[PDB]
Amino acid sequence: MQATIYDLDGNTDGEVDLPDVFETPVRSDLIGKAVRAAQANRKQDYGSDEYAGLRTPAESFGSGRGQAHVPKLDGRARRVPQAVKGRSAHPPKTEKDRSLDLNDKERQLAVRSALAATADADLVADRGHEFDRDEVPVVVSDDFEDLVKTQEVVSLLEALDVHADIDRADETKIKAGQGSARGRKYRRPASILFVTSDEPSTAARNLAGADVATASEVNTEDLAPGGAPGRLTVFTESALAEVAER
Amino acid sequence: TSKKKRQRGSRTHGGGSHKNRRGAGHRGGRGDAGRDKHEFHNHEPLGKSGFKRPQKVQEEAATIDVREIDENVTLLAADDVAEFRVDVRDVVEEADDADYVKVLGAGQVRHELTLIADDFSEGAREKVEGAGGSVELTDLGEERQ
């Protein structure tokens, strides 16, 4: 198909062939698998101290004093799992492999599949993104890379009737639970993904919910956050073409 | 829901009497204990058998069936097309870490072929010639006598 190209003023400026990958049938299960793996792979190993609760010579008295055969020290029960201050019976272990494998072909297929979900306005809308456009993804002239001020990217997005999504992401959620005690107090909706070619857009990155990537390494996660396909994206002239051979 | 997830409240988690799942006695001994006594069943029998020759006095032939060669003649365009002429050595994978290449005669040969290899099987020849073809024994192949 063909995709319309836009200049920094938001005006049309020709158009190009939308590469074939964007016609890859959408496979949400393969995409979900890909995201699930990337998420598991950055998780850190953990586990309780292997000697926790074992630093004691506590011994059981056995039968005779009308007492349960429980290891005790200084009249205190210890070591065993049912004992307060005792060891953890089956605790998290450092040796556990918390990574997930994924064949390269299966992963690459998912990237292509996620790329393709980006060109389906109905899907993009279902995913949740707020926009008032018909063509998707949004293709823009390579000059986009030369921008510097965030507000300039704002004007362009407003001109492109795509700024509504940023307003959507301009609301953080203060999570329920103890994540807060560990630095995970906030979370927020995912908005527009800017895919450039030379370097990620420093001008767009700070936008609420925004994500920036480069055609050479954009992955399943930026294309489909949380494994949900159809992210409202904005490619760069060259980014669009370079992404064709992924 | 998995089986594991359904065991809470069951008490014995599928073990039957709670006197069953204890130590190695419940397995009749650890590892292959009793492989000649209480658990001889389906176990390989005891004993020695044969011998082994030293690994550096052993030859490993790289083999291929005419069927493989013949089925890919056209595809193997990057290889001679005479009155096809094919040096099996340039065809067999793993033909490097092998001491020699041998052509076996499994399948059919629907073309006339001139095969060059370190050795062939009786049937490999009968078939190749039978389809108006020839067989050329390599120089290395000159170890038959």
Binding site: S180, A181, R182, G183, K185 | -
Partner: protein, 119 residues
């Protein structure tokens, strides 16, 4: 760091010279323009206006600045004890705004007026 425990920790355990920044307050529009800064370290000479608590709206002279507890006392911003005596109600500088500086110290003034640095 990004971890809440460490963030609070570094603040509660900061050495004295690093606590000056815990008693800084935003400058009035004029002063901001005048010294090219958005805020300053509140001194026991400055005049300030309360913009938040129960004393929001009042202005007064800073009578004391406690670095140990990172708080300030402002003239007339007080509480009445049971015996009747009047005592100061400590304020977080974050709820106040400096409307007039005490530049009796050449160093502070020099610091404020310098451009490469702030006071």
């Amino acid at each position: 760091s990004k971890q809440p425990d460490k963030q609070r920790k570094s603040q509660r355990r900061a050495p004295l010279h690093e606590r000056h920044k815990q008693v800084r307050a935003t400058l009035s529009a004029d002063l901001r323009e005048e010294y090219g800064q958005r805020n300053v370290r509140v001194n026991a000479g400055d005049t300030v206006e309360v913009l938040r608590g129960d004393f929001a709206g009042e202005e007064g002279e800073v009578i004391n600045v406690d670095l140990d507890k990172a708080v300030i006392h402002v003239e007339d911003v007080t509480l009445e004890k049971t015996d009747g005596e009047e005592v100061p109600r400590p304020l977080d500088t974050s709820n106040v705004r400096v409307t007039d500086l005490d530049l009796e110290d050449e160093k502070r003034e020099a610091r404020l007026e310098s451009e490469d640095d702030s006071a």
